[PDB]
Design a protein around this ligand. Structure first.
Ligand SMILES: [K+]
Ligand SMILES: [K+]
Ligand SMILES: [K+]
Ligand SMILES: [K+]
Ligand SMILES: [K+]
Ligand SMILES: [Mg+2]
Ligand SMILES: [Mg+2]
Ligand SMILES: [Mg+2]
Ligand SMILES: [Mg+2]
Ligand SMILES: [Mg+2]
Ligand SMILES: [Mg+2]
Ligand SMILES: [Mg+2]
Lengths: 136, 82, 140, 140, 130, 140, 136, 140, 136, 82
C-alpha cells in the first residue's frame, strides 16, 4: 500500500487509530497491511480467501519466524482493497493480501467496515470490528 | 501509529542506514539470497540497497597464495594511476 | 497424492475421502519392499493418523527462530508413518531364518530412544535436528 | 541422463517424463551388482524423489561461506538414492546363508546415525563434510 | 541453487574501464561489442578482452581485469594446472582442448572441477580475425 | 591405457570411445583376482566415472601448499574405482563358505569411515595423507 | 596523425594508457604512431606487411640512429588505419606506416585490438596485446 | 634380475622387455610358498607397477635428511608388490578349512592401516621407519 | 650463465627490466635462468623441449619445494641459447635449461623474442611476451 | 633486478658468510649429501665451500669410553707441540 508524491513513493501508515496491538510469531513471510490468522500456537500466517481466518493486520514486513506486531479489532486501518468499495460495506480478507467485500466473497459476515471508499487496487480506510476462526 | 520496523519509518532508523552500509561493504555480488538472511533482506530492504560487491574492499585487495614481494594486502584503488 | 501428507492435520485426515487416504497409504507402502502387505488397512491408517498427530504436536514450533521440522515435511511424515508401521509389525528384524535360508542385517540399535530403534526412525530423526536442543531466547 | 539428477528439484522430478525418470532410475540401479531388481519401480522412484528432496532441504546452504554439498552433486544424490533403496530392502545384509553357501560381510557394526548404517550412506557422507559443523559468522 | 560468491581478482594491476553493453556479473568473460563497450563472450574464441570485476547493469561503467591479471573464474568442466582456457559462451570458461579454438586466453594455476572456481592467469586477448 | 585414468575427468570419460573406456575398465579389473566378472559393464563404468568425479571434487586442492593427492594419481583413481566395484558387490567379504570349503579373512576391524571399509579404500587413503587435515594459512 | 579544433591542427598523443615503454635505436627515420620491428641488435625499423614484424609503435618522430621510445604490448594507443575498423577488430602493420585488419591482411593473427572504430585514414584507439617475430 | 626392481621407475617398467618384467615377477612370486599361481600375469604385473609407482611417490624423499626408505630398496619394493598381490586375492586368510583339514593363523588384532593388514605389508613397514614422522627443519 | 673477467666468473643478472615478478613453489631443483611451466597447483617445474610448457624463467637456484621467483611475460631477460640466434627471432624453451629458436623446434610460435643475438651456448637478451600451456 | 637469493648477490649477504662458516665448523666429511639439506647446499653454495671436517673441533677431541685421567674433551691442536 503506497502513495505517490512527485517522483517519490511513500508507504502509507497502516494504523490510523487504536491501542489493540499484540505480538505474534510469523508463520511465513508477511508484508505490511496483510490480513493474517492463527496458524499455530501464537503463530500467524496470511489469511485465505473466505471466512474463518482473521485475527488482525500485520503492521510491518517480516521474514518467516520473526516477531510480528499485529493490529486487532477496535483498530482503524488503511488497507488495500482488490475491488471497488463504499462506506458501510463490510470487508473480509481476500486471500491475495488485499481485502474484498463480504458481498463478493463466499462468506456472509465481515471483519472490518469501510469508512472511506476506494477503487480496485487502492487504499480504503476501515474499522476492524471482529475476528474469525475455525467454526466448522 | 508507527514502529521502527514499519515501512514509512525505515529511513529514520540509524540502524537501517548502518546495516545497509555494512551489507554493501560485506557483499561480493548482487545475489542477496546467498549472502544474507531472509530477515536481513526484509528488515533492511536490501533489494533497494545498491549491493553488487563494488564497495567491498576485498574486491580490490590482492590476496595471492605465495607472497615473495609483500604484494598481499595492497589495494588497487590506492595506487598512483587510480 | 491429491492432498499431500504434509498438508493435512489429524482432523483433516479424518475428513478425507477413503481414496485420498488410500493414495497417502499407497505412498507410505512404497517405503518398504514388502509394502507391509500382511498388516491390514486400519493399522496403516492408524499409523499415519498417529504420525500426523505426532508431527503437529511433538515436531512443530521453532528453536532459536529456526523451524524444528527443518527437512521436507512430506518425507518426514512418511518416514514417521513407516517407523510406526514397523513397530506395529514388532520392530526391525535383526535376523530372519526359514527353509535353510538365513539373513542377518546391520539393524543393530543405534541407541535406546524411540526413533533410534528402526531405519525409518533413524531417517525421520535427520529431518528434525536429530532431536537436539538449539533453542535460545533473550530478555527485553 | 538428459536432465541429470543434480539438475532436478522435487517439483522438477514430478514434471519429468517417464523416460527421463527411467534414465535416472537406471543410473541409480548401476550402484548395486544386484540392481535391486526384485524391488518395484514405484519404490525406486520414491527413494529418488526422497533423495532429491532431502538433498535440497538438509544438505543445501553454506557453512563458513563453503557449500554444504562439497562433492559432486550428481553422485551425492545417486548414493543418497541407493542408501534409501537399501533401507527399503531392510538394511545391509551383515550375513547371508542358504543352499548356495554362506558369506559374512565386513560391515563391522558401523555407527548409529542413518547415513552410517549402509555403504552408500557412508559414501554419501564423505560428499558433505561427514556431517560436521564447521559454520562461522562475525558481528559488525 | 545459490553458491556463495567470490573475490574474482587475486592479483595484478591491469584493470581498465569500459561501459557495460548489457547486465554483467562478477567473473564473467567479456569482449568489445562497441566503442569501449563490453558484452558477454561467445564460445569458440575471437571474443575475449578480460573478466568483469563486479556486478553491473547495462550502460554502467565497468572495471575489466585484462591480461597480466590473476583471477578466479568458474569453469564448465574439470581443469588442472597448465590447462589453457577460454570463454565458454555460458558465462564460464572451458579448456582449449574442449573448444573449437586452437589457442587460449588464460592459463590455469589451480585446478577445479566442473562448476567450481579455478585460479587462472590471463595472458592473451582475442578479437575478430575473420 | 591410451589415455590414462588420471588424464580423464568426468566429462572426458563421457566423451571417450567404448574402447578407451574398456582399456581403463580392464586396468581396474586387474586389481582383483576375480576381476568382478559377474558384475556388468555398466556397473564397472559407473564405479570408474564416480571415482573420477570423486577424485576431482573431494581429493583435489592444496594443504599448506602441498597437493592433497600426494601419491600417484593413476593408482589412486584405480584403487578408488576398485573400492567402488567392491561395495557395489556388497561389502568386502569377511568370510566365505561353500561345499565344505571355507575361508575367513583378516579384513575386519578396518574402521568406520567409507574408505576404511575395504582393502582398496585402505590403499587409496595412503595416497591422500590418510584423510588428515594439514592445511595452514597466514594473514597479510 | 592529427586532430582538428577550429582552424588548428594538433598532433595526437600516441599513448592512452600503459607503462610498457621501452628504448631502442632507430634503424631508419620514423614518425609518431608508426609500427616497428627488430631490424638488428636493439635496433628497430618500420614494419612490413603480413605479420612476423612487430615489437611496438614509435612514440615520437626520430632520424636514423637516434634513440627511439616505443609502446609495447599492455599499452592502449591512438594509431592511423588504412581501412575502416570497428570495435573488436584485430589489426596489425600494413607496411604503409599504418595498421590494417587481420581480415584484410594475409596474416591470421593480430597485434592490437580495436577499442574505438575509425574510417580509412582516421585515428582508431587500440590495445596492443602481442608482438610478432621471425618463426620461420 | 638383470635390471633390479629398485633400479626401475614406473616409466622404466613399461619400457622393459616381457622377459625383464617376467624375471622381476618371478622374484616376487618367491615371497609366497604358493607363488599366487592361480592369479594371472596381468594382475602380478599391475601389482609390481603399482608398487614401483607407490615407492617413488609415497615412500621417497628425506626426513631429517635421513632417506625415508632406510632399508634395502629391492626387498622393500618386492614386499610392497607381495602386499598388493595378497590384497588382490582378498587379503590375509585368517583361517582355511576343507576336506584336507583346517588351519588357523596368528594374524590377530592387526591395525587399521593397509600396510598393517598383511604380513608382507608389516615387513615392508619396517623398511620405511614404520611410517613414523621424524622430519625436522630449521630457519636460517 | 656467466661473464668472465680475468680469473673471475660472475653470474649474469637474469632480469634486465620488467615489474611483473610472481612467486611459485619449486616442483624440482631448478637453476637461475631456466624456463619453467606449471606442473601442479602454483607449482613450477623445468620446461620440456617443444610448445605448451612455459610460464616464465626462474630467477634464482632452488631445491625442491622451495619458493621460486619468476620473471613472467613483459620481462626482458638474459638467457642462454643452445643455438646461434639473431634479433627478431622467436625463441622457445629447449628442454635442456636453454632456449632455442621456434624455427629449430617442432612448435610454430615462441614465448620470447631475441633483441640481442648470441652464438650457441651464449647469453642473448630477449623479451618474454607470451605463456604457453596444455591446448591439446 | 637482483633478489637476495640471486646468484650474483650471494657474496653480499651476511647470512651466506655466517652459514658457510657454520657448515665448515659442523661438518664431518666432504660428502655434503650425507649431512646437509638440498636447501642448504643450494642456498649457501656449499659445493664451493672447502668443507672437509678439518675445521670441526670434534675431529680433534678425545672421547675414550673409560677415562681415569680427565683426558676426554682435550683438543689435540691445543697441545704444546702443535
Ligand atoms: K471469490
Ligand atoms: K584435462
Ligand atoms: K563446443
Ligand atoms: K596485402
Ligand atoms: K628439437
Ligand atoms: Mg479507539
Ligand atoms: Mg535447514
Ligand atoms: Mg571442496
Ligand atoms: Mg594499463
Ligand atoms: Mg603485459
Ligand atoms: Mg638406517
Ligand atoms: Mg617494462
Amino acid at each position: 500500500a503506497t502513495e505517490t508524491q512527485g517522483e517519490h513513493t511513500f508507504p502509507v501508515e497502516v494504523l490510523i487509530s487504536g491501542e489493540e496491538l499484540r505480538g505474534y510469531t510469523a508463520g511465513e513471510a508477511l508484508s505490511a497491511g496483510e490480513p493474517v490468522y492463527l496458524s499455530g500456537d501464537y503463530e500467524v500466517s496470511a489469511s485465505s480467501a473466505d471466512g474463518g481466518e482473521f485475527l488482525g493486520v500485520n503492521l510491518y514486513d517480516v521474514a518467516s519466524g520473526e516477531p510480528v506486531a499485529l493490529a486487532g479489532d477496535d483498530c482503524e486501518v488503511r488497507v488495500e482493497v482488490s475491488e471497488q468499495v463504499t462506506a458501510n460495506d463490510e470487508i473480509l480478507p481476500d486471500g491475495l493480501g488485499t481485502f474484498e467485500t463480504v458481498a463478493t466473497s463466499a462468506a456472509s459476515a465481515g471483519v472490518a467496515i469501510v469508512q472511506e471508499g476506494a477503487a480496485s487496487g487502492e487504499v480504503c480506510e476501515a474499522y476492524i470490528f471482529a475476528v474469525q476462526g475455525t467454526t466448522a | 501509529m508507527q514502529l521502527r520496523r514499519s515501512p514509512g519509518m525505515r529511513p529514520m532508523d540509524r540502524d537501517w542506514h548502518q546495516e545497509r552500509a555494512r551489507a554493501r561493504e560485506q557483499a561480493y555480488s548482487s545475489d542477496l539470497t546467498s549472502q544474507f538472511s531472509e530477515s536481513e533482506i526484509v528488515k533492511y530492504e536490501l533489494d533497494t540497497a545498491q549491493i553488487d560487491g563494488s564497495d567491498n574492499p576485498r574486491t580490490y585487495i590482492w590476496n595471492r597464495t605465495i607472497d615473495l614481494f609483500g604484494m598481499n594486502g595492497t589495494d588497487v584503488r590506492e595506487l598512483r594511476n587510480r | 497424492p491429491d492432498p499431500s501428507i504434509d498438508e493435512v492435520s489429524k482432523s483433516d485426515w479424518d475428513a478425507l475421502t477413503t481414496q485420498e487416504q488410500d493414495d497417502i497409504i499407497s505412498q507410505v507402502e512404497n517405503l518398504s519392499s514388502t509394502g507391509w502387505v500382511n498388516t491390514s488397512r486400519e493399522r496403516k491408517a492408524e499409523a499415519i493418523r498417529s504420525a500426523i498427530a505426532e508431527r503437529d504436536t511433538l515436531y512443530s514450533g521453532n528453536m532459536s527462530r529456526l523451524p524444528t521440522l527443518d527437512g521436507d515435511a512430506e518425507y518426514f511424515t512418511l518416514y514417521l508413518s513407516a517407523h510406526k508401521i514397523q513397530l506395529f509389525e514388532g520392530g526391525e528384524a535383526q535376523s530372519e531364518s526359514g527353509e535353510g535360508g538365513s539373513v542377518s542385517y546391520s539393524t543393530g540399535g543405534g541407541g535406546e530412544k524411540d526413533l533410534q530403534k528402526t531405519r525409518y526412525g533413524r531417517m525421520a530423526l535427520e529431518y528434525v535436528w536429530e532431536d537436539n536442543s538449539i533453542a535460545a531466547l533473550r530478555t527485553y
